Design a protein around this ligand. Sequence first.
Ligand SMILES: *[C@@H]1O[C@H](CO)[C@@H](O[C@@H]2O[C@H](CO)[C@@H](O[C@@H]3O[C@H](CO)[C@@H](O)[C@H](O[C@H]4O[C@H](CO)[C@@H](O)[C@H](O)[C@@H]4O[C@H]4O[C@H](CO)[C@@H](O)[C@H](O)[C@@H]4O)[C@@H]3O)[C@H](O)[C@H]2NC(C)=O)[C@H](O)[C@H]1NC(C)=O
Ligand SMILES: Cc1cc2nc3c(=O)[nH]c(=O)nc-3n(C[C@H](O)[C@H](O)[C@H](O)COP(=O)(O)OP(=O)(O)OC[C@H]3O[C@@H](n4cnc5c(N)ncnc54)[C@H](O)[C@@H]3O)c2cc1C
Ligand SMILES: *[C@@H]1O[C@H](CO)[C@@H](O)[C@H](O)[C@H]1NC(C)=O
Ligand SMILES: *[C@@H]1O[C@H](CO)[C@@H](O)[C@H](O)[C@H]1NC(C)=O
Ligand SMILES: *[C@@H]1O[C@H](CO)[C@@H](O)[C@H](O)[C@H]1NC(C)=O
Ligand SMILES: [Cl-]
Length: 581
Amino acid sequence: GIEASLLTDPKDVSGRTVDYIIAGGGLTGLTTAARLTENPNISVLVIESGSYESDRGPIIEDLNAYGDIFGSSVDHAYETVELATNNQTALIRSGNGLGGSTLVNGGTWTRPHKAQVDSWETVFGNEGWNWDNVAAYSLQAERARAPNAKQIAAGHYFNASCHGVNGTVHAGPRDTGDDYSPIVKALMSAVEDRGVPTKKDFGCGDPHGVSMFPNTLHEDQVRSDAAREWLLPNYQRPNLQVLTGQYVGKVLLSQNGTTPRAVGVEFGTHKGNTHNVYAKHEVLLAAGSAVSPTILEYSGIGMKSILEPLGIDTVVDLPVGLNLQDQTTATVRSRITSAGAGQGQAAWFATFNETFGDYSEKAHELLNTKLEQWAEEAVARGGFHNTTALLIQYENYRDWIVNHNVAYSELFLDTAGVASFDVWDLLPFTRGYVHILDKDPYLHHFAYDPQYFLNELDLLGQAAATQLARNISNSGAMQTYFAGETIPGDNLAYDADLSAWTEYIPYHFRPNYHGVGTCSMMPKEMGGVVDNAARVYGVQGLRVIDGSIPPTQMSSHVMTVFYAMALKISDAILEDYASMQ
Ligand SMILES: *[C@@H]1O[C@H](CO)[C@@H](O[C@@H]2O[C@H](CO)[C@@H](O[C@@H]3O[C@H](CO)[C@@H](O)[C@H](O[C@H]4O[C@H](CO)[C@@H](O)[C@H](O)[C@@H]4O[C@H]4O[C@H](CO)[C@@H](O)[C@H](O)[C@@H]4O)[C@@H]3O)[C@H](O)[C@H]2NC(C)=O)[C@H](O)[C@H]1NC(C)=O
Ligand SMILES: Cc1cc2nc3c(=O)[nH]c(=O)nc-3n(C[C@H](O)[C@H](O)[C@H](O)COP(=O)(O)OP(=O)(O)OC[C@H]3O[C@@H](n4cnc5c(N)ncnc54)[C@H](O)[C@@H]3O)c2cc1C
Ligand SMILES: *[C@@H]1O[C@H](CO)[C@@H](O)[C@H](O)[C@H]1NC(C)=O
Ligand SMILES: *[C@@H]1O[C@H](CO)[C@@H](O)[C@H](O)[C@H]1NC(C)=O
Ligand SMILES: *[C@@H]1O[C@H](CO)[C@@H](O)[C@H](O)[C@H]1NC(C)=O
Ligand SMILES: [Cl-]
């Protein structure tokens, strides 16, 4: 089977050459490995730090066991710096194993707003990166199943035109076999009373209102992790090889002309016992947004101000590691009446005004007047290097909010015995960074600082959205099932105002684990690290193809876009392979 095909001994790859080396066998890495090896003449070696976990059992295969895997060897649990908002560190859950974070994630399958993806082309100068093109690649990746009568009665709505049905990633309604809770439709009724839309298909380009959604699982409810979907059907390909249990430490560079060329990578688990493997065509970094930028820095690609003090020569100076954008998540949970029993998840993608309510006027005033100041402050905190360029991102977010009315926060509902909301501001203005703190890749000594709540609108927005979750939990039809709040519960007065929520939130939040931007895909002039074909500026044969590259956040869960991104970049890689024969 697959396990016997996987390589574990470095001696089996040391010194060899393949066409492409992919660092990281996660979502983007395995999608790309599969796409590239469709041509039998193209060889790929994936180097993954973890191992095969897809058939371990329910802890991985059952989406309802979500979170049980945290703290295990399948969770990297990257620790942040001591955060300024609360003087505590936080853990960034991140999958360690073939499939990456798709082994441990919530399985939510939704897409962002058309205007958000269109701006990657119109504002971030990435030719061809627009909604129509990216969505086509997303549907190509997708193998969706329409909901049945029971699922539709629970609240599902599926527009076939917005989904691929002959792709690779199996997606369909989560259905534990139990009755669906009426609380999903109660939330829909409660927001309908406020004039908010419901049941829009969140795969169509307008994620607004309250809807249910597909999940990444097969009909039999087994998790559709990226290894199960992209590696398990293809592992017998002789041109596709996978080394497990090893970390890529750095990219090996050779230079005989005006630009360095990536010729391979160094890998291992500890300093002093490393090996190299080589790429005839290209090295592709797919180790995740917390790691790919560090691999570049360990290689001499990053800011001299960061590298020089660590004893690393700066081969290519780029703002690697800046522009980190992750969201903050808080919880409101309530006990329910027995009539609310049953399974079901849904989410409210709430606009800026839906989020802020009566505070909308004040929040809009901040958005209209503080952008330059906020940009200067984020740059001074080291979250970005160029104020003028950061202001472009801020003006883009303001445009999304004011002129497109895109969803600003997400209130994610879980039922199954309670009414629980995990809530996050989708569009943070704060910008953080990740930088290595030592030259030894295998020490894994780094400073990962998302700078949560260091921008005032992010704190106000999170507080408003979380207060909204409490409000809606006891509004309209939701009152039918409400049986008392349990979180915050005693920890925050039930009648708390917005100011009280802003004081509470820094001590009751978790990272959302949607970090993007550390190797941003935008022009070098704007602070970018990679071009529109994911190529690292000024380096031959080196690309970053994972969550490090989106230059902005999006009003959605990211898998639909990341699968699309990997297929789109794979086409660019194949075009270069075809022309360079
Ligand atoms: C994370 O941790 C850091 C620390 O590592 C925090 O940053 C420090 O924050 C503290 C405040 O909590 C701050 O200390 C104050 O400095 C002020 C001057 O800049 C002082 O005015 C103040 O002293 C008064 O309050 C103290 C606390 O009760 C008293 O012990 C002290 O005697 C002072 O009170 C007096 O005031 C009058 C003066 O008019 C005097 O006549 C009387 O004696 C009266 O009693 C504090 O010492 C630090 O400057 C911050 N920085 C550092 C490096 O320590 C940060 O806030 C934390 N963040 C979070 C989110 O928790
Ligand atoms: C807890 C959690 C819940 C989530 N829920 C959802 C959800 O419901 N819906 C959704 O759409 N998205 C969700 N996501 C996000 C989504 O899973 C990730 O954004 C996506 O998997 C990122 O893909 P990637 O290719 O960038 O990185 P990953 O999938 O993280 O893969 C990177 C891979 O690199 C490996 N690696 C790390 N360092 C090295 C190294 N030095 N050398 C070699 N390999 C290395 C890792 O082990 C990993 O397998 C969630 C994420 C988390 C953490
Ligand atoms: C479904 O898709 C069709 C075809 O694009 C479109 O005409 C229709 O408006 C869509 N309806 C909804 C509710 O998404
Ligand atoms: C949001 O509220 C502001 C302030 O009242 C108002 O000017 C604006 O038109 C509202 N936007 C939307 C989309 O309702
Ligand atoms: C700063 O960013 C602006 C806007 O993108 C750009 O025009 C300018 O060249 C940048 N300057 C530097 C020194 O990076
Ligand atoms: Cl299926």
